[PDB]
């Protein structure tokens, strides 16, 4: 039973890392389509100078 709990914890942590990295990568994706107003460029590389 202890190993089953620990196994759930380990699966959760692995998923957290996957979610965390996906979130982190969302900050680097250039919104191709002009339309979406919402995603304000965070980086100057994406800045439309």
């Amino acid at each position: 039973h202890l190993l089953r709990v620990t196994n759930k914890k380990l699966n959760h942590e692995l998923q957290s890392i996957v979610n965390g990295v996906q979130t982190l990568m969302s900050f680097f994706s250039t919104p191709e389509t002009a339309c979406e107003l919402s995603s304000q460029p965070i980086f100057l590389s994406q800045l439309l100078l």
């Binding site: 982190l24 900050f27 980086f43």
Partner: protein, 103 residues
């Protein structure tokens, strides 16, 4: 990873903040309109660099290669770099670019 995401989210939030730049109506002397911090910081950093470049320019025209003026030049470059970096860390890139457009 969470710590890094939080940092980038803070930068995104700061980037959505509309910085209002006052209309240059020539005639209107006095109204003391307060200059946005980003525009001030960017102007100062650009002035500091301009002074530095101007000093290099003046020295090139006056042939008097005074041999002691190099150590002061470096310090001045470093000071600019540090300040420049601070500006890039304190303000969002969109705000800094907007400030440059206005200038």
């Amino acid at each position: 990873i969470q710590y890094r995401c939080e940092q980038l989210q803070e930068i995104r939030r700061a980037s959505q903040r509309e910085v209002m730049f006052s209309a240059v109506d020539p005639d209107l002397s006095s109204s003391t309109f307060l200059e946005p911090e980003v525009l001030r910081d960017v102007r100062e950093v650009c002035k500091l660099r301009f002074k530095f470049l101007r000093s290099l320019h003046d020295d090139s025209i006056s042939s008097s290669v005074h041999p002691g003026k190099e150590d002061l030049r470096s310090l001045s470059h470093q000071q600019w770099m540090s300040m420049a970096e601070k500006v890039w860390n304190t303000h969002t890139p969109n705000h800094i670019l907007a400030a440059l457009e206005r200038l």
